[PDB]
Symmetry: D2
């Protein structure tokens, strides 16, 4: 499922930094119960950066086993070398995931033609649906609407998570792609605006701690009831901002711990424990949302 | 050494995308003859992003073998995960390299405290000298002078490659570190300016194809002969700019092939072959520098 | 009238640089006939910068005389000194204009508190409605939503022309102001998006040459018929971009001359005549819009 | 001269907002005693934006009278309209000023060809030496090195105040102009660096309150004594930063009052009185420099 509120799920860890199965089960049950549309497993918010390939596959497989067919799972699968991206994607074929979230090559700053070849080749070598992920603040490269237009013609490239926060991209892309191509916000603070402009949903950090309100907001937006969705969005707006007061997923993991959703807020270096000042800003945002 | 003209050497490839030993030997001999001070092996310009860790080590080991003690070799060794950077660096202990060029975590955008802990931990698990590498346009992370100052206190963190192109950083860092911390430019176009402000050399892309000019420029600079140095700079300025006309190392590999320094200009996806327009551009720059 | 398609009208000049009454009459008749909502006289596109105070008042008065009650007129009235802004605004009280478009102080980069005091004082000293004008690319200062919220409480401050092109500002502002506060786009390329997000109209450059299509687009947008408005917007999008291929109003004046709407395309230094390359880009945009 | 430490002098005011002759005399005597090289009268820091053209001329004439030939006086003379800049400059012909600091048109964002024609026309209608002034953060216009090169050929365009803080510009301009074109910094924080790269002095805000230190810094710099110069720079660096804690000249006028150099810190709207927090900040900077 590729519409509505999709959670960019944390990968909960014990005090040693290893994946905590009990905490993950608690999160998945929460998402099933709260009407979340799907789970992105080992995306950015899932510390894709710091898990080894074994861990990355283990977390996705554990998420699928725990979900037990109750909610669809999308795996985070990008890489900055095209042969690697292909390789890692093969490993998930027939896993039970419904799709892959594949980021633009980071660090090596490819041309638009390079991006076209990269993603075309990934898609050629799988039957899985691919969702392109554009996040220039992290990767140093910006997948432009024209190139998204070229890629949307590839049968298996089915949508984009547009994380620039630049709302002009919504209708620049829409006009170049077919009506079944999915446009998903990757910027919680601008996501309601994104849907009002014609976007189809959000791949959300805030959804980790406010799943029901996120799922209701996105349904109201889909129905056209923007004034009603905006009431919910105004209560969540402090979280949408303050979950990035320190690098993601530091604040959201601390919030999940405070709510009792995970056992510990531990992350892997170079992510650091939340500062005291951060804890206070996040807890005030949680109170604004009505969660504490 | 860690001073003068240090080449960010290309990883020359065959048509299959694997390292070409004959071409690498030819380059290394060229650098020895040209007066280059050191070689950074499998840094950014050497396609660190698209070699796997074994391929990367094979290139470094081959480069050391071929250098045969005639020219010092520094290995590119970043990772965006701290545990992984430590293992990946450990592999070169007792290899023969003289130090490591370690990049700031890319994509995950750690805090300055996070950067401090990452580099401190790397430095504690090795005896090799570490040169920090700041290139926010690629990494989405900017290692600020205050943090460099804190890290320069760690015994084996010995210098920085400052690739922002922001010349104010030279004296901001110089005032916070001891007189033997090395400051190197990572931006060819501003490197002579960077040395004029107090920097000690440059880790250069342009040096791949103008090694003698780059070494003579840097010697003059170190001797305080800036007007003289600048005449050489003006001759090379179109190269300093146009070797980034398309994403590095696309232009510089073509240039190396056009000069007879390597057998093929092949790169790995998502890097693409140079366009016709890019060729003409780089060819005019080579003509300007007197190399063609 | 402060809703719909409002034209940022050129000030047509003869070959000597003096205002051309016959050309101005032709434009005003065209706007009356084409369903434009109102005319902004001597705004940015009207070369407010280069007219002396005598000329500025003369053009507004001539525009009012020629309009003859058929279309409302808004005068451009900003200044970067608060006493001056007050002074110039007094001169239009009882003129027959319906309102003033008052820009944020340019060059001196005031604080948000400074902006608050500036605009509060202007509004205090007139009965005329004031429309705030935010255009940081021109002024060096950015009137933020919080400050717009404070100013919207002043009885006479009735709306804003938001020219950043940053579409997140629409609902940031809306939520802080009352439902009768008018939100007007000042960025033709993003103006339809702006209205879809809840904006009320556009103060438009494109409207100078495509008045009817602009007026129909804005009415469809007001009715909620965004798919229909977007068809028109897609035909106008080359003009929305290419009217800024050289500094405004250079391209739009050349376009008005090409259509026969004004006698000459003359501007005042430091605005320069359109280049040949500019003429060709603009004429292709006009053909795309169906106007040539 | 047009070299060494040149003060961008405040226009001290009474509580009514008009020039305070007693305070201006005291400042001018202070500069003569301190070794300042020249005074820029009614530039940016002198509130050029909020004086009318007569008030501006009165200040310049009073400054010359009070200077009594002891220290050269340059007048701020920009306009964003070419015809107006020419008239406004003509007024100072035979006044006694030694030259004019003429700003790039603000707000109307002319092309480089437009900037060339504007400055060329100004220079042709006067015999006074013109110093170009590039400050895109205030003007929205960036006068590029290539254009400076073209303008430096005009006999009485004699130098540039480069207030971008972009240190690469020093050598880009120096390579295109003759050895007697003057390059001055307009950014206190980077001015010593700018001189280290080949610049000839600074038009300084900090010099209002640390005139002796600034003059000694600039002498040392001109003599090649950069380490010595830098010790003075480090003492003044918090001032160089915090005199812009709130919009210039809000901090520097408060500082002048706190030092007993002027009678009141009054400014004209939209400049606002300094906040309590800003006072404490600037006071700590003054303490650091040893001036309080
Ligand atoms: K498709
Ligand atoms: K050290
Ligand atoms: K109001
Ligand atoms: K000259």
């Amino acid at each position: 499922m590729f519409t509505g509120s999709i959670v960019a799920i944390v990968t909960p860890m014990d005090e040693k930094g290893n994946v905590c199965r009990a905490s993950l089960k608690k999160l998945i049950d929460y998402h099933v119960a709260s009407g979340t549309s799907a789970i992105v497993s080992v995306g950015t918010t899932g510390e894709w950066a710091t898990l080894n390939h074994d861990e990355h596959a283990d977390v996705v497989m554990m998420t699928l086993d725990l979900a037990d067919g109750r909610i669809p799972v999308i795996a985070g699968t990008g890489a900055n070398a095209t042969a690697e991206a292909i390789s890692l994607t093969q490993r998930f074929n027939d896993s039970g995931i419904v799709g892959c979230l594949t980021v633009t090559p980071y660090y090596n700053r490819p041309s638009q033609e390079g991006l076209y070849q990269h993603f075309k080749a990934i898609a050629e070598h799988t039957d899985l649906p691919q969702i392109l992920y554009n996040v220039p603040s992290r990767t140093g490269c910006d997948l432009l609407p024209e190139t998204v237009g070229r890629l949307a013609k590839v049968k298996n490239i089915i949508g984009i998570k547009e994380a620039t926060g630049n709302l002009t991209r919504v209708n620049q892309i829409k006009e170049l792609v077919s009506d079944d191509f999915v446009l998903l916000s990757g910027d919680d603070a601008s996501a309601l605006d994104f849907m009002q402009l014609g976007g189809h949903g959000v791949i959300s950090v805030t959804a980790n701690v406010a799943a029901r309100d996120m799922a209701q907001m996105c349904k109201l937006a889909a129905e056209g009831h923007f004034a009603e969705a905006r009431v919910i969005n105004q209560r969540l707006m402090p979280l949408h901002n303050k979950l990035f007061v320190e690098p993601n997923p530091i604040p959201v993991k601390w919030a999940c711990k405070e709510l009792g959703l995970v056992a510990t807020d531990t992350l892997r270096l170079p992510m650091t424990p939340i500062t005291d000042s951060g804890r206070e800003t996040v807890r005030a945002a949680l109170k604004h949302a009505g969660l504490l």
